[PDB]
Design a protein around this ligand. Structure first.
Ligand SMILES: CCCCCCCCCCCCCCCCCC(=O)OC[C@H](COP(=O)([O-])OCC(O)COP(=O)([O-])OC[C@@H](COC(=O)CCCCCCCCCCCCCCCCC)OC(=O)CCCCCCCCCCCCCCCCC)OC(=O)CCCCCCCCCCCCCCCCC
Ligand SMILES: CCCCCCCCCCCCCCCCCC(=O)OC[C@H](COP(=O)([O-])OCC(O)COP(=O)([O-])OC[C@@H](COC(=O)CCCCCCCCCCCCCCCCC)OC(=O)CCCCCCCCCCCCCCCCC)OC(=O)CCCCCCCCCCCCCCCCC
Ligand SMILES: CCCCCCCCCCCCCCCCCC(=O)OC[C@H](COP(=O)([O-])OCC(O)COP(=O)([O-])OC[C@@H](COC(=O)CCCCCCCCCCCCCCCCC)OC(=O)CCCCCCCCCCCCCCCCC)OC(=O)CCCCCCCCCCCCCCCCC
Ligand SMILES: CCCCCCCCCCCCCCCCCC(=O)OC[C@H](COP(=O)([O-])OCC[N+](C)(C)C)OC(=O)CCCCCCCCCCCCCCCCC
Ligand SMILES: CCCCCCCCCCCCCCCCC[C@@H](O)O[C@H](CO[C@H](O)CCCCCCCCCCCCCCC)COP(=O)(O)OCC[N+](C)(C)C
Ligand SMILES: CCCCCCCC/C=C\CCCCCCCC(=O)OC[C@H](COP(=O)(O)OCCN)OC(=O)CCCCCCC/C=C\CCCCCCCC
Ligand SMILES: CCCCCCCC/C=C\CCCCCCCC(=O)O[C@H](COC(=O)CCCCCCC/C=C/CCCCCCCC)COP(=O)(O)OCCN
Ligand SMILES: *P(=O)(O)OCC(C)(C)[C@H](O)C(=O)NCCC(=O)NCCSC(=O)CCCCCCCCCCCCC
Lengths: 99, 174, 128, 459, 178, 52, 87, 69
């Protein structure tokens, strides 16, 4: 021997002292309420409410706005015979090349 | 429903041949269509009528947001952060609109191919040319600008392309 | 008379065709008895622990512990940079890198040269 | 962002003033509430980010990471409940305090608007992780793991600080918006090469990159369950976020300096998958799988195309969730048998059916089963790499095959077969463990349903 | 599987195992019963012809040549009984075998669903717990000072005792547990 | 319950070291054979036959 | 599906096979008849008897256990123990 | 004769499954009922041109009633 050391204790089983244990705490009431709050808050509140909130988040990415603008521009372009997509993004009149 | 623009989403007129049977046997397809109309179509039509009656009780409207035009990066001075920001936002909105235009043309092409079916290689050649033109223009504009694309990078690409075109034209007619 | 079976690394020789299985010396019997004694001692220890009613847990296996320790935590202290180890490490750690660098550099140079010459089919390529 | 920052700094006094038997309940409930509050950041714009103030801003890249961190905190709390039953009240409160401080630092790091504040917080995350590892690890190698982790990170990141202060002196500001609008091309000279090396090498050591990755197995194997969960899921994504942020000012030099790192990352995917094929430790297998996935993310960021950033973000989120779930399952198996050897315990499908189901689902998500976001990100990265060059497809294909091989190998080894006869302490799975696995797995499927929220700002 | 192996196989054991293997492979080759009977009679005629041999060296050489002949002439796909190792039904029911230590982790409601079974289970557990000391004492009394030399366990000498190390052999799962 | 002397160590050079290693791995001294000392990190771990 | 085996059925079937053996006199055959001590057989005959039992019952007896079954009662006990027959 | 079938304790797994189902359906059913009622009795907004000299709000620029809220 080299030290006055405690022996390694045997691991305790929560099911021995409480067959209805949820694995949260060794106190039955505290374990039950920990399980209840975890399940309620996490599953119900977070999952369901956050999922429906994200599903019905407003269209701030302007996907539908972009689609409507594209439809309007396509209609105007093909009604007047103009090309659907312009050749250049900017105006060559405003662009001054170095020469 | 047909709550969309027929000119934006073209569709050739539908020619359905008239039924001209040459046999005395009954038509199981016709009998099953009658059964389907009696059992499904009428109940769903009644349900939709009730729902649309409920919708018309309180009718409210939503609008399409209109964005004003602002000076672009060509008119923006160097190191002018406010004008650069406005031009960048305008350019990004234009980029998204162009992406949706390309999507519209691709939808046209897909629908035309499926509709024509066995004779698509000839019938839906008008959509193929429009898609080719739109795709070429879109590629020339928003070509490989990278993941950090910007109005300044697009302007630089356009200036380079314009210089190349001018040099080619000069060396051709010179 | 019959064609002979030639053992390989993945087709090892069967125990009935091993020449040493038929030339047995009295020392070989002693070795076999010693092996059986060792196996019996280990089996007895394991069976005592396994049939102990008061045991609740895992019977620790020193052989398994030694195997896991030797394969993971015992490699570096027993490593000496011999020429064999140096050459094998250099090869298997550097050669693939330069091989792939050369391959990808050649491919990308060819593609870039084609793009510059304007003879590469880039039509309908609007997603990169 | 103060509406999210302040509740964590209120979690601290609540934890320290709560009763001895209510600390876990209070921490879990209020962490879940904070996660619900942080869910509002997903309402991003399409053109520019959300600029709350001069100090904090949120983007389509920052929001999913913040949500992931705020969601990951209560799961770490549950795991800590699992493995810290016999600890004293003060030490349990200290552990919860370390977790809370780490979450707060991560939130501020993700929402920082300047590179120097980002660096300060991103280095501040080292202290709680090192304390957690070297204090609540179970084996002797925890001290060595902490030393390796700390010194790898610091040796990577100090030249980043030098480069950042140099960049501020040269240009005028380190504000991300300014350095994006006022960005100028980087010339091909030795000084620019070394600045690029400083920044990129810092974030690659953090990532990690193949050859600079031994700290990852060392720290993840020896860390406690909560430490492993936070190390794999969020702390590995600091390098990816930094690279996606810092590469704005490194062009066009990135087109020339990316070759060594691309080759390293691809061959590292191959090598780490092959290592996973022959691992005797389950945690080491999970750690090397994490290394392979992060190497794929590195490839995406280095090729730097709009289709590669979306895949990078999706793969980061998916890998974080999957690795956290795998570590939780491995920790449950370890706590049952008190050993990390994989072949020690078998027949766990016969002994524990629901845990076998969780293992099956986690291993299916690991090998990128469609239409999971893991596969979405991997497929986007593969397509971008194919556009870059046409042999990356070969490398990605062999990597994917080996990934499926080792995932199903670990599944079959742990769950299938004949149960070990002498292991008679396999108690039924706890409701806490089952709920932990369910809370890990359900958001993955919900994000599969709605994938546009984790595809970054280039969507 | 129920018998402790010896240190080595004697010549008689080697030749008997070779004879059984040769008969099984001959049956695999000779599908039909009459043909199999004819050729099995021929094989046993060969074995009986070589049965009487005083020279052990010559007997060993004959055995070696016979083993070479068997390996050359063996059936590539020999018949295997379905439950035998390598058979199509081998280890099929290993996933349905659950032990009594798993059985004692049940909930009180589940145990109350089967009241009469668990009384007998408790009787068996008491019987096991009341014999372990006698079993270990008997094992340690009969071992040589060096240790066990074989894997054979002694029986119960006394009337009130049980054969040492009996629990798992007796309570092993049934061959068709479900 | 495993002590520090039960773990694998360096390559056994003297015959006494080989005997101690063989005793550690529960093997006969004659049957014990380590990998060749090529610096590959095997140590004193026995080289068992390559069978499955 | 298949009817379960019983000790009486196993004994009847093994005695049926032994009585169908041509080297055993059915009149002097019983469940305690030693194959070599009082039936006058040898090792090859015992191996053939074991193989016949294997064919009869559709399962294989390992050679380590087959070399020790020298009685019909021993064969019955082995088959019953392997098949988990207790009645 | 009927023989006892030795199985691991499935009571805890079944209890967890029933608890998860109950707590998901505790608020999921009200959410689904509310969504159905809103979609039936309060339909989506109809696209219309902006009246002259009128400045709407962002929720007036959005369509679905829940998104507007
Ligand atoms: C050594 C053998 C070797 O060179 O292997 C190259 C090989 C990469 O393959 P490659 O693409 O053929 O190499 C670059 C090309 O030859 C040429 O590539 P290029 O033409 O595209 O130019 C890029 C080149 C530009 O050239 C330079 O910048 C030259 C000047 C370098 C200055 C010193 C850099 C110090 C910091 C390096 C990282 C330290 C950690 O970049 C570098 O040289 C970067 C060097 C560092 C790469 C990252 C290493 C991470 C750690 C790897 C594991 C270590 C264990 O492996 C390594 O670079 C890692 C070697 C580890 C030992
Ligand atoms: C969601 C499910 C998440 C996993 C299950 C969690 C619950 C559980 O333990 O269920 C078993 C358990 C079965 O009862 P048991 O017999 O007592 O359990 C014993 C064993 O655990 C019973 O275990 P088992 O082995 O008999 O079966 C359990 C099942 C459980 O495993 C799974 O469910 C695994 C599913 C994910 C696989 C890995 C990810 C791959 C990516 C998929 C992404 C899809 C997202 C879709 C949206 C999801 C939104 C949530 O596993 C399988 O069926 C094997 C894998 C099957 C894979 C099928 C093919 C997957 C790839 C293709 C999918 C394509 C879908 C889209 C198609 C688009 C075009 C039309 O379920 C329940 O008791 C359910 C009650 C509570 C359910 C929650 C509340 C419901 C009401 C609200
Ligand atoms: C473990 C596993 C996971 C566990 C859970 C994890 C956490 C999950 C949390 C929630 C996550 C989601 C939250 C967000 C949900 C969401 O965004 O929902 C969107 C969406 C709701 O739409 P919305 O955007 O809100 O409304 C806009 C619409 O325009 C509005 O259209 P409308 O104007 O026509 O509206 C009419 C109204 C009503 O319409 C009707 O009544 C018409 C339908 C019947 C027609 C026929 C009637 C015949 C009657 C005959 C007699 C008539 C008499 C009439 C009167 C006569 C006298 C006057 O329709 C509705 O209300 C739609 C159904 C809503 C259901 C809500 C589902 C989401 C629940 C979220 C919570 C979930 C918690 C867990 C589960 C709890 C239990 C569910 O959801 C659905 O539509 C339901 C699901 C999709 C069904 C679509 C229809 C079937 C399609 C089948 C396709 C099959 C393809 C092939 C498949 C197989 C391949 C092999
Ligand atoms: C989760 C915590 C939330 C905390 C904050 C809660 C604030 C609640 C404030 C009161 C509710 C006001 C709703 C709008 C009233 C109608 C007028 C209007 O502006 O309409 C705008 C727009 C359009 O209106 P409009 O101006 O175009 O005209 C419509 C016609 N009239 C004039 C008759 C109203 O939307 C609607 O009118 C439809 C509203 C639908 C509301 C139900 C769907 C959402 C359900 C949410 C459930 C979550 C809990 C909610 C609890 C409270 C419920 C009341
Ligand atoms: C049963 C077997 C299941 C397993 C096998 C799967 C087989 C297929 C099962 C399919 C079931 C669902 C089919 C019906 C889906 C209905 C809901 C769906 O349509 O809505 C989705 C929406 O789902 C939600 O968006 C998913 C939410 C995902 C985020 C949840 C986060 C919860 C907090 C957890 C944090 C985790 C952090 C991780 C990093 C963020 C898609 O969006 P969208 O159709 O257009 O919304 C319509 C509303 N509009 C019209 C106004 C737009
Ligand atoms: C690693 C070994 C090599 C690195 C050793 C670090 C010691 C410094 C050596 C490189 C110094 C480079 C340098 O000073 O110049 C860079 C340049 C100087 O240019 P100026 O003089 O200011 O103006 C232009 C003059 N015409 O300054 C900068 O670009 C700022 C950034 C330079 C920081 C130094 C770079 C450090 C190298 C980064 C490698 C990181 C390795 C990571 C280690 C990981 C270990 C797990
Ligand atoms: C012509 C067709 C070639 C086809 C190639 C087929 C594969 C063969 C090449 C790889 C096989 C292994 C060779 C390298 C491994 C070293 C061999 C070795 O270990 O030898 C050492 C001693 O070291 C040597 O003998 C060296 C001889 C070979 C040297 C080869 C030239 C050295 C190359 C220098 C470059 C190293 C870096 C390469 C990668 C750089 C980046 C590309 C001792 O060998 P033992 O195993 O103990 O004895 C076994 C006897 N049969
Ligand atoms: P039982 O206890 O009565 O004792 C019989 C034995 C044989 C044990 C004798 O006591 C004995 O040992 N006698 C002397 C040793 C001896 O007989 N040696 C030679 C016997 S082996 C032999 O002769 C076999 C040769 C013929 C069989 C060869 C098999 C090859 C055919 C393979 C075919 C596979 C596919 C068809």
């Amino acid at each position: 021997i080299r030290l006055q050391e405690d022996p390694d204790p045997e691991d305790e089983n929560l099911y021995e002292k409480n067959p209805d244990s949820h694995g949260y705490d060794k106190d039955p009431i505290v374990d039950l309420w920990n399980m209840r709050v975890v399940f309620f808050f996490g599953f119900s509140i977070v999952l369901v409410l956050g999922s429906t909130f994200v599903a019905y988040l407003p269209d701030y990415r302007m996907q539908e706005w972009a689609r409507r603008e594209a439809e309007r521009l396509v209609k105007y372009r093909e009604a007047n015979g103009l090309p659907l997509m312009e050749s250049n993004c900017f105006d060559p009149n405003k662009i001054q090349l170095p020469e | 429903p047909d709550s969309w623009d027929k000119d934006v989403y073209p569709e050739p007129p539908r020619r359905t041949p008239a039924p001209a049977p040459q046999t005395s046997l009954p038509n199981p397809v016709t009998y099953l269509t009658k059964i389907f109309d009696l059992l499904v179509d009428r109940p769903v039509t009644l349900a939709r009528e009730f729902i649309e009656q409920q919708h018309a009780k309180n009718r409210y409207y939503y609008y399409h947001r209109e964005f004003r035009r602002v000076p672009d990066i060509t008119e923006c001075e160097e190191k002018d952060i406010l004008c650069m920001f406005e031009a960048e936002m305008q350019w990004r909105r234009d980029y998204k609109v162009d992406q949706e235009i390309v999507n519209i043309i691709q939808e046209r092409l897909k629908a035309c191919q499926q509709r024509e079916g066995e004779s698509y290689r000839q019938n839906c050649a008008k959509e193929l040319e429009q898609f080719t033109q739109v795709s070429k223009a879109f590629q020339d504009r928003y070509s490989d600008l990278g993941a950090h694309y910007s109005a300044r990078k697009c302007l630089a690409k356009q200036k380079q392309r314009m210089l190349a075109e001018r040099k080619a034209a000069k060396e051709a007619a010179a | 008379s019959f064609p002979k079976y030639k053992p390989s690394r993945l087709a090892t020789l069967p125990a009935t065709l091993d020449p040493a299985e038929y030339d047995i010396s009295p020392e070989t019997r002693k070795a076999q008895a010693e092996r059986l004694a060792i196996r019996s001692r280990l089996k007895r220890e394991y069976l005592l622990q396994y049939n102990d009613p008061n045991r609740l847990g895992v019977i620790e296996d020193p052989a398994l512990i030694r195997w896991t320790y030797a394969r993971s935590a015992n490699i570096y202290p027993n490593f000496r940079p011999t020429p064999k180890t140096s050459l094998l490490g250099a090869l298997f750690g550097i050669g693939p890198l330069f091989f792939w660098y050369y391959v990808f550099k050649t491919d990308r140079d060819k593609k870039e040269k084609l793009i510059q010459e304007g003879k590469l089919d880039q039509t309908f390529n609007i997603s990169y | 962002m103060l509406k999210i920052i302040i509740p964590t700094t209120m979690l601290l006094p609540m934890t320290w003033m709560s009763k001895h038997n209510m600390i876990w309940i209070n921490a879990t409930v209020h962490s879940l509430l904070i996660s619900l509050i942080s869910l509002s950041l997903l309402n991003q714009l399409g053109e520019n980010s959300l600029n709350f103030s001069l100090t904090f801003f949120s983007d389509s890249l920052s929001a999913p990471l913040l949500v992931l961190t705020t969601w990951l905190l209560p799961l770490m709390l549950m795991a800590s409940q699992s493995h810290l039953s016999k600890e004293t009240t003060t030490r349990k409160k200290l552990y919860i305090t370390m977790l809370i401080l780490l979450q707060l630092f991560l939130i501020m790091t993700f929402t920082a608007t300047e590179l120097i504040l980002f660096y300060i917080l991103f280095e501040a995350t080292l202290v709680p992780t090192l304390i957690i590892i070297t204090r609540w690890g179970n084996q002797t190698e925890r001290l060595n793991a902490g030393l390796y982790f700390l010194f790898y990170t610091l040796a990577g990141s100090l030249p980043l600080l030098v480069a950042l202060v140099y960049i501020q002196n040269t240009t005028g500001s380190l504000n991300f918006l300014i350095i994006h609008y006022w960005s100028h091309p980087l010339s091909n000279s030795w000084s620019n090469i070394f600045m690029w090396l400083a920044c990129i090498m810092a974030f690659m050591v953090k990532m990690p990159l193949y050859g600079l990755h031994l700290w990852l197995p060392k720290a993840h194997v020896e860390a406690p369950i909560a430490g492993s969960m936070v190390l794999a899921a969020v702390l590995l994504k600091l390098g990816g976020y930094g690279m996606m942020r810092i590469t704005t000012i490194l062009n066009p030099l990135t087109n020339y300096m990316a070759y060594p790192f691309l080759m390293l990352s691809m061959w590292g995917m191959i090598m780490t998958s092959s290592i996973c094929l022959r691992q005797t430790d389950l945690k080491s297998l999970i750690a090397y799988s994490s290394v392979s996935h992060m190497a794929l993310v590195i490839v995406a960021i280095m090729i730097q195309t709009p289709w590669s950033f979306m895949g990078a973000t999706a793969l980061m989120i998916a890998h974080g969730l999957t690795s956290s779930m795998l570590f939780c399952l491995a920790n449950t198996n370890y706590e049952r048998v008190h050993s990390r050897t994989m072949i020690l315990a078998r027949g766990l499908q016969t002994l524990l059916p629901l845990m076998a189901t969780w293992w099956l689902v986690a291993s299916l998500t690991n090998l990128a089963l469609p239409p999971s976001i893991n596969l979405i990100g991997e497929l986007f990265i593969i397509t971008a790499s194919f556009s870059w060059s046409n042999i990356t497809i070969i490398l990605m294909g062999m990597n994917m095959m080996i990934t499926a091989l080792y995932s199903l190998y670990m599944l079959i080894t742990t769950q299938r077969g004949k149960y070990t006869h002498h292991i008679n302490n396999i108690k039924p799975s706890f409701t806490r463990e089952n709920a932990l696995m369910a809370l890990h797995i359900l958001p993955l499927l919900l994000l599969t349903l709605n994938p546009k929220m984790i595809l970054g700002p280039l969507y | 599987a129920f018998s402790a192996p010896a240190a080595y196989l004697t010549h008689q054991q080697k030749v008997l195992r070779l004879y059984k293997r040769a008969l099984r492979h001959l049956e695999s080759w000779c599908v039909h019963r009459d043909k199999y009977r004819y050729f099995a009679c021929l094989m046993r005629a060969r074995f009986d012809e070589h049965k009487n041999e005083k020279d052990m060296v010559k007997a060993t050489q004959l055995l070696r040549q016979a083993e070479e002949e068997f390996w050359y002439g063996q059936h590539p796909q020999p018949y295997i009984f379905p439950e035998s190792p390598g058979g199509t039904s081998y280890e099929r029911y290993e996933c349905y075998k659950v032990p009594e230590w798993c059985l004692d982790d049940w909930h009180p409601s589940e145990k109350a669903m089967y009241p009469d079974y668990f009384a007998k289970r408790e009787q068996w557990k008491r019987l096991r717990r009341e014999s372990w000391e006698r079993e270990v004492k008997q094992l340690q009394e009969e071992t040589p000072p060096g240790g066990p030399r074989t894997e054979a366990l002694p029986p119960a000498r006394k009337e009130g005792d049980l054969p040492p190390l009996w629990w798992h052999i007796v309570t092993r799962p049934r061959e068709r547990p479900m | 319950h495993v002590t520090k002397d039960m773990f694998p160590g360096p390559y056994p050079k003297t015959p006494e070291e080989r005997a101690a290693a063989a005793k550690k791995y529960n093997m006969r001294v004659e049957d014990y054979e380590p990998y060749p000392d090529d610096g590959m990190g095997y140590g004193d771990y026995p080289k068992l036959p390559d069978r499955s | 599906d298949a009817p379960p085996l019983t000790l009486e059925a196993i004994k009847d079937r093994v005695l049926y096979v032994l009585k169908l053996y041509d080297k055993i006199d059915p009149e002097k055959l019983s469940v305690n008849s030693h194959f070599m001590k009082d039936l006058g057989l040898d090792s090859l005959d015992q191996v053939e008897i074991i193989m016949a039992m294997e064919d009869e019952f559709g399962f294989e007896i390992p050679d380590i256990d087959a070399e020790k079954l020298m009685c019909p009662q021993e064969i019955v006990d082995y088959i019953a123990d392997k098949k988990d027959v207790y009645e | 004769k009927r023989l006892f079938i030795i199985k691991p304790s499935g009571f805890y797994d079944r209890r967890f499954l029933k608890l998860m189902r109950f707590y998901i359906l505790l608020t999921g059913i009200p959410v689904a009922i509310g969504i159905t009622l809103v979609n039936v009795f309060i339909g989506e907004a109809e696209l219309a041109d902006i009246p002259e000299g009128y400045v709407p709000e962002h929720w007036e620029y959005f369509k679905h009633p829940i998104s507007r809220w």
